MMTF fields as JSON, N, C-alpha, C and O atoms, coordinates in Angstrom:
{
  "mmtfVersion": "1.0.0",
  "mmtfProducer": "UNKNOWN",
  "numBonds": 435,
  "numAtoms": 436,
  "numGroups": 109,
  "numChains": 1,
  "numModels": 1,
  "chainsPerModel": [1],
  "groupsPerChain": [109],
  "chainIdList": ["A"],
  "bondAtomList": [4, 2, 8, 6, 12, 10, 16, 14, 20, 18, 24, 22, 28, 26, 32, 30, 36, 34, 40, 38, 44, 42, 48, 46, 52, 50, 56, 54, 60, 58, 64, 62, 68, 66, 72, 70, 76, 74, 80, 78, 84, 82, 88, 86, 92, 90, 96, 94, 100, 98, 104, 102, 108, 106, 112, 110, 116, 114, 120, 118, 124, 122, 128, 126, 132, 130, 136, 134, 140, 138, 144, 142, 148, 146, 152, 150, 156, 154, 160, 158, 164, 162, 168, 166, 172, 170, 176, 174, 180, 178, 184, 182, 188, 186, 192, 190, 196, 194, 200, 198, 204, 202, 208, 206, 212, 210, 216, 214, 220, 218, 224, 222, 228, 226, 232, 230, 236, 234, 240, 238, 244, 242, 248, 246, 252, 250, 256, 254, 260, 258, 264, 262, 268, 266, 272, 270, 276, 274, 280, 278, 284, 282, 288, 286, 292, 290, 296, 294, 300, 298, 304, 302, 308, 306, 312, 310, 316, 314, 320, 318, 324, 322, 328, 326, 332, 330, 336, 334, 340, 338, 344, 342, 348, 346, 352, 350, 356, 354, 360, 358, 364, 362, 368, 366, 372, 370, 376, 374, 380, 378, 384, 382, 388, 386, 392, 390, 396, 394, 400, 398, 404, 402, 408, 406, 412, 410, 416, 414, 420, 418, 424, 422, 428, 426, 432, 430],
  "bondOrderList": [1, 1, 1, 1, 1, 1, 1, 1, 1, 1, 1, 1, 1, 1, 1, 1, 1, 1, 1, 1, 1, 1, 1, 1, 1, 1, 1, 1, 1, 1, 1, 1, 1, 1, 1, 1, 1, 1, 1, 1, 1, 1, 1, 1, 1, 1, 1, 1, 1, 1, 1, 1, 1, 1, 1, 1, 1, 1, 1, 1, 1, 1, 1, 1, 1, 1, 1, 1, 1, 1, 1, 1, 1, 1, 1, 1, 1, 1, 1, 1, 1, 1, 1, 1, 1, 1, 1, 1, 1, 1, 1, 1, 1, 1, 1, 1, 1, 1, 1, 1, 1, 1, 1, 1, 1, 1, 1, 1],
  "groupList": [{"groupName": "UNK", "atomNameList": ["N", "CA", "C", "O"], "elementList": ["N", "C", "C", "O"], "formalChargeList": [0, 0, 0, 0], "bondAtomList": [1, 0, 2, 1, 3, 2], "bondOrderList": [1, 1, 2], "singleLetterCode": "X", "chemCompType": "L-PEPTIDE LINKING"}],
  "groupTypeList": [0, 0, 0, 0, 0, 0, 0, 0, 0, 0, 0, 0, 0, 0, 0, 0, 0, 0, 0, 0, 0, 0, 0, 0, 0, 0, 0, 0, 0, 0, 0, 0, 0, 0, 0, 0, 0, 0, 0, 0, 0, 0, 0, 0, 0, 0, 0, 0, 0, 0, 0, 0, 0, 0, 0, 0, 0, 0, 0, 0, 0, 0, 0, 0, 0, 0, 0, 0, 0, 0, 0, 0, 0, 0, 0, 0, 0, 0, 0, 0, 0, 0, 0, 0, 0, 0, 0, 0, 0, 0, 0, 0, 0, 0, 0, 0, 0, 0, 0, 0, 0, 0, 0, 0, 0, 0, 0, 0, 0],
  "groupIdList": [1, 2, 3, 4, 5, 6, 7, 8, 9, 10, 11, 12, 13, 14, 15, 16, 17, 18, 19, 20, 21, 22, 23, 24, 25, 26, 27, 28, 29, 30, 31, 32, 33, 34, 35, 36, 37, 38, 39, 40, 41, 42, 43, 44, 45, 46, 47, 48, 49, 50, 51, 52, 53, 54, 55, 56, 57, 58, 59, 60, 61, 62, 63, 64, 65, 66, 67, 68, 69, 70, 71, 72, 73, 74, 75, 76, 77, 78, 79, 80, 81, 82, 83, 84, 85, 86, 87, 88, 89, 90, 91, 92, 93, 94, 95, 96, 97, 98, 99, 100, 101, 102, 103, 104, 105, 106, 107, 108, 109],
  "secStructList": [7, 7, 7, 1, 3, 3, 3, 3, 3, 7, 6, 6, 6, 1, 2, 2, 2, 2, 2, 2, 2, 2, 2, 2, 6, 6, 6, 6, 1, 7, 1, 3, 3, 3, 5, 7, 7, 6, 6, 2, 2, 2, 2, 2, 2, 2, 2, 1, 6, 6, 7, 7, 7, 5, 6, 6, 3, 3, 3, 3, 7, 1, 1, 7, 6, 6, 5, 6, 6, 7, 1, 6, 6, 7, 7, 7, 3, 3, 3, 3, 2, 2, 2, 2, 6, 6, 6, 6, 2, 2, 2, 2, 2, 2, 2, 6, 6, 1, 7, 6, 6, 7, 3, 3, 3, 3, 3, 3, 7],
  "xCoordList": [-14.456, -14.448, -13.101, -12.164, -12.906, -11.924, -10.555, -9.5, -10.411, -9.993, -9.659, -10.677, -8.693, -8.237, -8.559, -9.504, -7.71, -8.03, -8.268, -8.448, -8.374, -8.705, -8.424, -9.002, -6.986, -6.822, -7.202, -7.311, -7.389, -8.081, -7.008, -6.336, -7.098, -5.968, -6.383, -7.463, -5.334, -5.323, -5.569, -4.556, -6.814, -6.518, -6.43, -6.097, -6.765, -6.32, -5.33, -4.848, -4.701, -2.792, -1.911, -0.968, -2.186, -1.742, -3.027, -3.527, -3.039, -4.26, -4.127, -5.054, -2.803, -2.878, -2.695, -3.239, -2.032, -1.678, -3.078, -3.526, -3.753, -5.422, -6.049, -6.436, -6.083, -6.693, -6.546, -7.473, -5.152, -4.458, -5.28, -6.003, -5.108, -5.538, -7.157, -7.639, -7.794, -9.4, -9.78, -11.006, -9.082, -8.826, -8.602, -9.131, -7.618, -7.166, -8.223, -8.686, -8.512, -9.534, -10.856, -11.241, -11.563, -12.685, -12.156, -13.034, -11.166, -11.009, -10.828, -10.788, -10.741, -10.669, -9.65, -9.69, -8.465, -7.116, -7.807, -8.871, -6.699, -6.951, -7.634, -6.577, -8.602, -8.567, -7.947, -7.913, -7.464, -6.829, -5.226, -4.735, -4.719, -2.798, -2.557, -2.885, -2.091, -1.798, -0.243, 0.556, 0.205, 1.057, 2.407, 2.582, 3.28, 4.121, 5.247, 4.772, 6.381, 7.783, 8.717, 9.133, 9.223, 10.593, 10.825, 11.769, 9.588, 9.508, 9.287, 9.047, 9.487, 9.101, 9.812, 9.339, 11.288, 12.054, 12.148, 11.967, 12.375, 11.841, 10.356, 10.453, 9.027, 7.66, 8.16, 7.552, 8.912, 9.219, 9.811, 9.352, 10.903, 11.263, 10.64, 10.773, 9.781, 8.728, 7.729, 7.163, 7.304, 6.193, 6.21, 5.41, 7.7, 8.248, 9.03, 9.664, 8.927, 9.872, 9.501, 8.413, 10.178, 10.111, 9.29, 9.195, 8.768, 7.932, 9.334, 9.844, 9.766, 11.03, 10.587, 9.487, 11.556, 11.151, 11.015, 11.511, 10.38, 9.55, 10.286, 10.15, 10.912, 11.561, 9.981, 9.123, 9.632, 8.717, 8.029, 7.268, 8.006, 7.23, 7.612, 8.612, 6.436, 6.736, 5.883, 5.026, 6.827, 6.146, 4.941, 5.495, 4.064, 2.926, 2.641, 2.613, 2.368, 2.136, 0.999, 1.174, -0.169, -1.194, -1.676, -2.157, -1.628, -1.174, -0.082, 0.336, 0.738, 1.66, 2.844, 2.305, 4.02, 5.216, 5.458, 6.287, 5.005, 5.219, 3.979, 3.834, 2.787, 1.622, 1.641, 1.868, 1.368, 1.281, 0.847, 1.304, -0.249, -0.741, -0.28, -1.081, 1.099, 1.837, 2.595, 2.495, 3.275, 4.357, 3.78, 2.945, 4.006, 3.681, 2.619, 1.903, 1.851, 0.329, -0.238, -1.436, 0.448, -0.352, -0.174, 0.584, -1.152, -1.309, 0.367, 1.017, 0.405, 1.12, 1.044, 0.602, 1.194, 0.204, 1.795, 2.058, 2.558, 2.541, 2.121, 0.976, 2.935, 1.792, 2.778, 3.826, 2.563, 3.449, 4.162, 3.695, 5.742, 6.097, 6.151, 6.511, 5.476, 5.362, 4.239, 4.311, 2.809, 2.008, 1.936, 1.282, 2.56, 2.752, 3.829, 3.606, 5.197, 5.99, 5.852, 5.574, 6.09, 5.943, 4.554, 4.623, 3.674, 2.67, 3.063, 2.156, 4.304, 4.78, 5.323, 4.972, 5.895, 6.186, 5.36, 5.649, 3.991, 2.994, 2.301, 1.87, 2.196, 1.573, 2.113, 1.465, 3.371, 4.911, 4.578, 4.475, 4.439, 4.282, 2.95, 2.737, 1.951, 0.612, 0.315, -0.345, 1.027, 0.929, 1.744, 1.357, 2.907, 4.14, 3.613, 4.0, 2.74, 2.176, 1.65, 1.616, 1.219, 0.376, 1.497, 2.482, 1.227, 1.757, 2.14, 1.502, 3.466, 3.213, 1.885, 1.536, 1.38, 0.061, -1.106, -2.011, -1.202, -2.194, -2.438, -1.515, -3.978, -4.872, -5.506, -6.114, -5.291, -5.43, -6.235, -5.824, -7.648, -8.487, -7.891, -7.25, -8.032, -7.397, -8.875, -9.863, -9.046, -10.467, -10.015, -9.555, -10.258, -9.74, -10.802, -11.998, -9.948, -10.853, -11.773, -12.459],
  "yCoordList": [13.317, 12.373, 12.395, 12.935, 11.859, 11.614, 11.18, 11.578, 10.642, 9.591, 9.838, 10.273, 9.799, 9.867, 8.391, 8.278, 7.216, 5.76, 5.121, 5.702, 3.855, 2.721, 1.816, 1.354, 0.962, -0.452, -1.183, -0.659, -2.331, -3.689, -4.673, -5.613, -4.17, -5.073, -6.615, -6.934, -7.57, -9.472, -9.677, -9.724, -9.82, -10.069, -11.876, -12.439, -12.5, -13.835, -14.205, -15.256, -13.304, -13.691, -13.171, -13.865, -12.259, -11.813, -11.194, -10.144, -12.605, -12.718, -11.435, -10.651, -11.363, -10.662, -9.562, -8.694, -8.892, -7.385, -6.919, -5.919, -7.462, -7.433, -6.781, -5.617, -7.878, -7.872, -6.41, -5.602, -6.164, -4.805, -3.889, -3.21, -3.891, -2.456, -2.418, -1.311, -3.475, -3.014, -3.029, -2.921, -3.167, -3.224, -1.653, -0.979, -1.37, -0.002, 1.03, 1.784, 0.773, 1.399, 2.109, 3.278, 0.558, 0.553, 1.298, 1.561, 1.587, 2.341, 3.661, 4.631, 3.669, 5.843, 6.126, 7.273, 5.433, 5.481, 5.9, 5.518, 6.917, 6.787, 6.322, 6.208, 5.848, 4.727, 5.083, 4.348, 6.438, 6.891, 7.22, 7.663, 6.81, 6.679, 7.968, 7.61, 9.136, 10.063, 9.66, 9.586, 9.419, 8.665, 9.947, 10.681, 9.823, 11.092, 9.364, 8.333, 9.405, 8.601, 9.028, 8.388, 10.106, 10.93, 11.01, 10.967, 11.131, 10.862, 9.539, 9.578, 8.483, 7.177, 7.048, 7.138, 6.775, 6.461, 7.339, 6.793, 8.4, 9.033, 8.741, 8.969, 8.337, 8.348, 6.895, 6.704, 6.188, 4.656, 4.591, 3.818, 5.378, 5.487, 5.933, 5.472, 7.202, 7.785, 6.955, 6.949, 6.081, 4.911, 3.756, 3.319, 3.413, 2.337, 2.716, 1.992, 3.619, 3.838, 2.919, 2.355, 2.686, 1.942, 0.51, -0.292, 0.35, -1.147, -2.241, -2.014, -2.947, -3.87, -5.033, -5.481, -5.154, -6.764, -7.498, -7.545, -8.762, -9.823, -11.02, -11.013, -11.898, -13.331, -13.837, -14.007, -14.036, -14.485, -13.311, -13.669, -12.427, -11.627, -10.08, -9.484, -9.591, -8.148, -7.566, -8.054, -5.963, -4.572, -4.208, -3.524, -4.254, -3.72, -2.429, -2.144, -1.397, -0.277, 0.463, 0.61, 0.811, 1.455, 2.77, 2.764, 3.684, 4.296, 3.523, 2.932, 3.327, 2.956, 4.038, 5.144, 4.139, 5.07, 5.424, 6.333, 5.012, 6.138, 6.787, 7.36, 6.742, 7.783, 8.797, 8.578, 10.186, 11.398, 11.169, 11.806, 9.943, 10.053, 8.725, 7.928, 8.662, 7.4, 8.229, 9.423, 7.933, 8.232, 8.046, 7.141, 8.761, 9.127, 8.779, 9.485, 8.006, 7.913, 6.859, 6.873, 6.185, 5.154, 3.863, 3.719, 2.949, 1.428, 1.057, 1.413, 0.145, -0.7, -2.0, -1.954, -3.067, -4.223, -5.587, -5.445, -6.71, -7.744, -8.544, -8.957, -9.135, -10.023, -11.041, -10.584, -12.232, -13.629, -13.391, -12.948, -13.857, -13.48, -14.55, -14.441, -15.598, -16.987, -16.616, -16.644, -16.137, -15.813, -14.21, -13.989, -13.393, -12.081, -11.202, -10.028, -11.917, -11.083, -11.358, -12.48, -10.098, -9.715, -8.747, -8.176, -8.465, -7.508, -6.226, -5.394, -5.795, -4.536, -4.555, -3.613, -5.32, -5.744, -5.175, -4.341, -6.089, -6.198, -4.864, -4.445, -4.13, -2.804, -1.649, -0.971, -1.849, -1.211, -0.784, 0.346, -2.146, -2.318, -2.042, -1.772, -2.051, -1.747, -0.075, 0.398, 0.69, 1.954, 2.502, 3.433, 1.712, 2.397, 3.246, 4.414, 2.891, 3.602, 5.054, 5.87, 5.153, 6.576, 7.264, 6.783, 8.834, 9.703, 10.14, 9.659, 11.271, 11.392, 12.301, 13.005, 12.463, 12.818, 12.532, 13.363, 11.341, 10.741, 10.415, 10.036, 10.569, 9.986, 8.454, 8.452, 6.991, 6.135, 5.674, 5.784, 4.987, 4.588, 2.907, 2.322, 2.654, 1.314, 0.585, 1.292, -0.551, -1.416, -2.941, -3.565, -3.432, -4.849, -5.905, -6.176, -6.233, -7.842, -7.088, -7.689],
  "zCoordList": [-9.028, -7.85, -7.14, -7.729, -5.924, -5.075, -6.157, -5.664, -7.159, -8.046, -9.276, -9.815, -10.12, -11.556, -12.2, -12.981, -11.835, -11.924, -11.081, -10.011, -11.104, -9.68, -10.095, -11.078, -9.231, -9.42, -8.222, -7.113, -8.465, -8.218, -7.421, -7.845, -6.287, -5.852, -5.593, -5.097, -6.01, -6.067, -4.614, -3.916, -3.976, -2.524, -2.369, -1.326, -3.502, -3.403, -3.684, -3.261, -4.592, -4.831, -3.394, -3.015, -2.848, -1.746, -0.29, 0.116, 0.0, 0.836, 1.953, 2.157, 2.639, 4.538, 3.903, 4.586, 2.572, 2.428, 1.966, 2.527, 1.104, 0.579, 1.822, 1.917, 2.888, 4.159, 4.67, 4.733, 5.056, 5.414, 5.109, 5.839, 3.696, 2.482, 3.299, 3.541, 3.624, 3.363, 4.344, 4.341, 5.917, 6.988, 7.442, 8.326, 6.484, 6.695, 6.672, 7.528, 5.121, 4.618, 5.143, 5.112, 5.795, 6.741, 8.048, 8.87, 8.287, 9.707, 9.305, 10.061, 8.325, 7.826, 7.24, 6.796, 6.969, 6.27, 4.78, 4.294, 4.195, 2.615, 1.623, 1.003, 0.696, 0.157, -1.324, -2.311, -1.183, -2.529, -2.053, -1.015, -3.245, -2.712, -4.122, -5.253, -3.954, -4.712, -5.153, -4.22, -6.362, -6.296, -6.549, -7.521, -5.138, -5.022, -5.005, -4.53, -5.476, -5.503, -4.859, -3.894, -5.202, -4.788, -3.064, -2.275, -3.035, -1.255, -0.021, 1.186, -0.933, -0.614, 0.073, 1.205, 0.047, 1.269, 2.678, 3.766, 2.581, 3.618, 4.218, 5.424, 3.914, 3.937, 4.829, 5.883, 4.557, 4.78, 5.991, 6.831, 6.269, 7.226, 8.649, 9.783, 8.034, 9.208, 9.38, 10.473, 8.336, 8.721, 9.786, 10.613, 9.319, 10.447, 11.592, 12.36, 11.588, 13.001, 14.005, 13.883, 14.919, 16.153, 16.03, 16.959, 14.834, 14.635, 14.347, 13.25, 14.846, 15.203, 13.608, 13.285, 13.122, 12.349, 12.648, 13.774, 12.279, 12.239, 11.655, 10.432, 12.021, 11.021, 10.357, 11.222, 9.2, 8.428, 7.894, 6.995, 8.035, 7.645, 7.48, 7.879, 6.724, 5.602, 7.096, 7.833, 7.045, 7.405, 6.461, 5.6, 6.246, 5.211, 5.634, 6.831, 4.499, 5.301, 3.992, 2.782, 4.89, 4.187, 4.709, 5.842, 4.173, 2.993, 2.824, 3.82, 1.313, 0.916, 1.1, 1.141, 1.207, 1.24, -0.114, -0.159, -1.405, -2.66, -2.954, -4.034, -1.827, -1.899, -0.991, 0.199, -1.546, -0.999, 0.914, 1.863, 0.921, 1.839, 2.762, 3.25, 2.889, 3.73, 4.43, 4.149, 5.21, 5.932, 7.296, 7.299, 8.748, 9.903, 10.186, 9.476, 10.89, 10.702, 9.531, 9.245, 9.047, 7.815, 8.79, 9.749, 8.206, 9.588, 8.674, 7.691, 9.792, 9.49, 9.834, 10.982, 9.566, 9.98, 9.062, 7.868, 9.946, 10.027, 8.975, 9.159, 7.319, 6.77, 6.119, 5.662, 6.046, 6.049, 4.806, 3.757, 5.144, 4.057, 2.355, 1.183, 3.367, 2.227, 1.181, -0.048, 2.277, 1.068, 0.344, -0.675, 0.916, 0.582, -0.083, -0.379, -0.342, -0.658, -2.082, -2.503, -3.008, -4.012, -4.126, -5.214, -3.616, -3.399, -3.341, -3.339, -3.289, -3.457, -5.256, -5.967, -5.65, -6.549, -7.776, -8.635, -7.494, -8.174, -8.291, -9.365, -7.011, -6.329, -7.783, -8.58, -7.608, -8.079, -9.65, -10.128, -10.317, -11.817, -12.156, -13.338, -11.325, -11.781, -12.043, -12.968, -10.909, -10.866, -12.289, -12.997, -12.495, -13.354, -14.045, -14.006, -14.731, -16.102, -16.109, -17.03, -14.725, -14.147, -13.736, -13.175, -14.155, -13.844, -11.977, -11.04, -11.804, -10.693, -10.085, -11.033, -9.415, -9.074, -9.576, -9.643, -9.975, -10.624, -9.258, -8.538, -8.71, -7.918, -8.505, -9.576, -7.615, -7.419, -6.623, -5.468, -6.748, -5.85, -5.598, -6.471, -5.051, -3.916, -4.2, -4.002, -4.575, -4.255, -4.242, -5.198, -2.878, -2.673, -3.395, -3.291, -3.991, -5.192, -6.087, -6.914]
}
């Protein structure tokens, strides 16, 4: 299949990034994040270009920037930072365990 594992993302612990992911999803984005690291900050940089910050709120970006399939072209989407920050966090520690190129299926709730 498309997929090695599949985590379960908290879309009630982190309601607008949840939203994002399955938002994304449904429009044709990824729903598998190949999990590449070494290239994250760069992937991060080409993701956000020219999107300005926000007082209250996180850049969200799906594809994620430590998956093969983020950078240039992944949404990026606005999400509060009262109910959302730590969702990278969480994102972060869930993956740890998987190898690099371990294929990851994304499934909101």
């Amino acid at each position: 299949a498309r997929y090695d594992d599949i985590l379960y993302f908290p879309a009630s612990r982190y309601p607008e990034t949840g939203a994002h992911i399955s938002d994304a999803i449904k429009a044709g984005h990824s729903d598998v994040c190949t999990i590449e690291r070494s290239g994250a900050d760069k992937r991060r940089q080409e993701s956000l270009k020219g999107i300005p910050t926000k007082p209250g709120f996180d850049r969200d970006e799906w594809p994620m920037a430590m998956c093969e399939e983020g950078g240039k072209g992944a949404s990026v989407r606005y999400v509060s930072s009262s109910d959302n920050r730590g969702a990278g966090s969480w994102v972060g520690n869930r993956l740890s365990g998987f190898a690099d190129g371990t294929r990851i299926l994304f499934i909101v709730q």
